[PDB]
Amino acid sequence: DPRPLHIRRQGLDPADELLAAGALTRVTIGSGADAETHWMATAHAVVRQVMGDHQQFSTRRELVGNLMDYDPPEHTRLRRKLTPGFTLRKMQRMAPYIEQIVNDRLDEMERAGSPADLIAFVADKVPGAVLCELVGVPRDDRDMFMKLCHGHLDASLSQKRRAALGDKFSRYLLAMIARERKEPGEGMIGAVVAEYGDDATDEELRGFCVQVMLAGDDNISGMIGLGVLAMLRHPEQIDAFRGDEQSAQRAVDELIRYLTVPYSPTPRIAREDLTLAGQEIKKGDSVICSLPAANRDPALAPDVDRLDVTREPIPHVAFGHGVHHCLGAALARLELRTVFTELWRRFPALRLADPAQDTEFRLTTPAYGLTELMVAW
Ligand code: HEM
Fold it and tell me: Are 281 and 310 in contact (CB under 8 A)?
């Protein structure tokens, strides 16, 4: 394997080499004139210390509205400004909408008949539709909006195409923001402007939309796909999605902890010299935290390496830690819970279409996941 240790998985787990590295050690990513050195933190307490001490570890190093690029006090102000579109009450209001979105996708899969690819019908479609509903993109515009969203970032396209889709995407978003300023709706944009008005600038809001579209897509499709695969491999646990809501929420939390789809959060930069876990960190050093390794730290529980949806909950760092803790965490838990509950309500006998087949993992994104999952029912 020529890939960095923090990118390695073995099935649903961290790779053994990644798990056996030190709590904090040096690594070099890349070669020749590209090669760089970083510290990699794999221990739960070290990742919490690094991520939680923003006075000591900065996330900077332009993109307006990208919260991850700022440090307090600038971060604090921007995050406060976007928070109205993510309150727990706004999430409760979204639930009916997310249930309809999931059922519409399940309907298409049902119509296609067994066996069918759960990744193409559900995992890769729900995330985007849910974000469109959150942002406030009108139904009939979603398909078009999503091609612009993905398109303006497709490295495979020429400068001329990417640029054209990008100019089209900004124009769509800016037009949406101006519409919302006039008559604020319940979407994210409308919630922010209703509270801040002109203080939330056009560029801030446009940038917020781009970043949210990015932050809540890959992590969720990876969790939908790896989550169904994990449950089908532990069938006695599926009942956690066939009971009350508490039961399902606890199963979703355990799956997020067990699978930790993001390999690492934004790299942290030491803003000064310090000693951490016995190592001497110097002003300017870069630190990469392995969230998957941290959520498999042995001190967390004697059976931390197993999936147990009924265990005593283990606080995890899959949504990060500190001021940058996932702003979309509540929506993510709700979305995943809705997907898994409606899935097993509709397909009680869901199973792998071919139990012998090798698993097709998605190894090219910032989040682990599946590229295809054939299921039958
Ligand atoms: C299973 C799903 C998800 C996982 C595991 C997850 C994970 C993360 C992590 C680890 C961070 C912290 C990054 C850092 O400290 O550098 C974070 C940040 C963030 N996430 Fe999520 N996320 C998920 C879903 C979502 C969704 C559904 C939304 C969008 C509606 C969202 C929006 C964001 C935003 C805006 C930030 C930046 C917060 C800030 O910098 O203050 N995430 N997420």
Answer: no
- Give the three-state DSSP class for 118: helix
Look at residue 39 and give its three-state secondary structure. strand
What is the distance in A from the centroid of ligand 1 to the CA of 320? 8
Question: Is the peptide bond prior to 73 cis by the omega test (within 30 degrees of 0)?
Answer: yes
SS3 assignment, position 26: strand
| Cα angle, residue 178 at apex, residues 174 and 183 outer, rounded to 5° | 145
Type and span of the H or E element at 363 = none
Which protein residues are within 6 Å of ligand 1, measured from CB?
51, 59, 67-68, 79, 134, 211-212, 215-216, 219-220, 223, 256, 261-262, 265-266, 318-320, 324, 326-328, 331-332
Domain 1-377, second-level architecture: Orthogonal Bundle (1.10)
40, β-bridge pairs: 25, 288
Domains of the chain, by residue range, sit at 1-377
Q: Give the Cα separation of 229 and 68 in Å (integer).
A: 31
| Angle at 63 (CA atoms; ends 58, 67), nearest 5 degrees | 50
